[PDB]
From a paper:
Long-term immune evasion by the African trypanosome is achieved through repetitive cycles of surface protein replacement with antigenically distinct versions of the dense Variant Surface Glycoprotein (VSG) coat. The mature VSG proteins are attached to the cell surface by a GPI-anchor, and consist of two main regions: (1) a large, N-terminal domain (NTD) of roughly 300–400 amino acids that is most distal to the membrane and (2) a smaller, membrane-proximal C-terminal domain (CTD) spanning 80–120 amino acids beneath the NTD that harbors the GPI-anchor. Therefore, at the heart of antigenic variation in the African trypanosome are the NTDs of the VSGs. These large subdomains are elongated folds centered on a three-helix bundle scaffold.
The structures of VSG21 and VSG545 were also determined, both harboring closely related folds and biochemical properties that distinguish them from other VSGs. Of note is the fact that both structures were obtained with proteolytic removal of the bottom lobe (contained in the C-terminal region of the NTD sequence). This cleavage occurred spontaneously during crystallization experiments performed with full-length VSG21 and the NTD of VSG545 that had been produced by limited proteolysis with Endoproteinase Lys-C (LysC). In contrast, for VSG21 and VSG545, the cleavage in the crystallization drops produced a truncated NTD missing the bottom lobe sequence but maintaining the 3-helix bundle and top lobe of the protein. No sugar is seen in the VSG21 electron density, and no predicted site for N-linked glycosylation (Asn-Xaa-Ser/Thr) was found in the sequence of the NTD. VSG21 and VSG545 are more similar to each other than these other VSGs, however, distinguished from them by the tightly twisted nature of the top lobe and, directly beneath it, the presence of a second three-stranded beta-sheet perpendicular to the axis of the 3-helix bundle. VSG21 and VSG545 align well to each other in the top lobe but not to the other VSGs with beta-sheet top lobes. Superpositions with predicted models from AlphaFold (which were accurate enough to solve the experimental structures by molecular replacement) show possible conformations of the full NTD for each protein. In this subdivision, we split the A3 class from Cross into A1b and A1c (which correspond to classes N5 and N3 in Weirather, respectively) based on differences in the top lobe architecture (e.g., the smaller top lobe beta-sandwich in A1c compared to A1b and the presence of a second beta-sheet over the middle lobe in A1c that is not present in A1b).
Residue numbers in the entry:
A (entry chain A): 22 to 64, 94 to 176, 186 to 294
B (entry chain B): 23 to 63, 94 to 175, 186 to 292
Amino acid sequence: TTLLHNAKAQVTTPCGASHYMRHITRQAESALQAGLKTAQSALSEAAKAIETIKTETKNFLAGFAAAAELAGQQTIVSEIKSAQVQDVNTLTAAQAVTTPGIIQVKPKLTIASTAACFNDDGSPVSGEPTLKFFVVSANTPGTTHNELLTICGHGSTGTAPSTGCQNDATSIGIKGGDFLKTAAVTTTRLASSAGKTYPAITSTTTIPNDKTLNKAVTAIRELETAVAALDAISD
Amino acid sequence: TLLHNAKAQVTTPCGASHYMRHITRQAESALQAGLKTAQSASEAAKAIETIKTETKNFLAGFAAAAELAGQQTIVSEIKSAQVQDVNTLTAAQAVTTPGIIQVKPKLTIASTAACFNDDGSPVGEPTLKFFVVSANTPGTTHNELLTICGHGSTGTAPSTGCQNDATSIGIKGGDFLKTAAVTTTRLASSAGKTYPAITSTTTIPNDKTLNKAVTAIRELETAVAALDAI
């Protein structure tokens, strides 16, 4: 039998989650090839093999596409989680509100120098199965001086917020920080009255959201049954 | 089998994701037909041999098209990211609790599956179009986006117009990202028909991610064509 899920994989990062999904597609492909080869060697048993492959193609390709789509989503999640507001040094308040010294909210991203989640040479960089995905939402700003994502006060113009903001509005800058908050969501397959099933993911205010994730997991489940039916050909 | 929706006008990231899914739906129909022919009945052996030799290229480009669809789905959601406007406040109270002026991240979260409605329906040489995001550029003087907002009157919304006046201070917000389209059109040359390399080194996704997927999509096109012959 073909093991779609990698037991020796510990998903702890978005890039890890994307490689786990790609592993599903690689394993799904091997099961399809073996079914194709079994029907090819039988050239009746070849008629029922081709029949099983054709009947399961819709379920196979829908879940294959869903695993790939989830790998794509996690790849973008792994890049966007780096989004930050940059610190800006304080400036005497009268000059901080107009040209040439206006204090700016500066977006910044950290862009991979390779294909995201991959090395330059092309290699990856990261019981019932568990599907784990990472999701983003708006970060929560601070609520007092010297906390993230706030206007930074200091008695001395020119001060870097990293050295400590004060309750002092003589000069003002910006203490930056992460624009997003990243969290994991998980669903662990379990035996159901008629087979196996994934509990729903709850994540209503994130990117991706749970409607997007649950739709894809449902299709991954159809890939798993399609692969099991494919393994039954050579068994 | 026509993998490419010729009558598609891709102008949004969600439209780009649906174009990618059209490719996968068309690719499926080519394999299904190829399997239906094989079901009928050495000819049966010929089809199987093809379907098998081309499965590797087929699933590689199929996965790349669906991967790109997943990437464009997130692009369509995060492109909503903004820094919120914050009303001005007397400067001495603006630097500490409880009035501290905050840089407030904000997203717009789809209430459905992104790029789909509740019912589940979607919301020449071919061209592949994708949308990418990059850091937005802040303004350089008062009342321009992504700057501290001065005003003479405390409690003033920045939409009233920021001034060269630091009596009260707030935040003039705006989009956190800029979103632009990248494209590549299949080109006839002595190399056959190939998609030119995209250059985009400062965006999410970047060109190395995109160019790798595009190369695989070209291999899908070649696989669908061989599947059509049988």
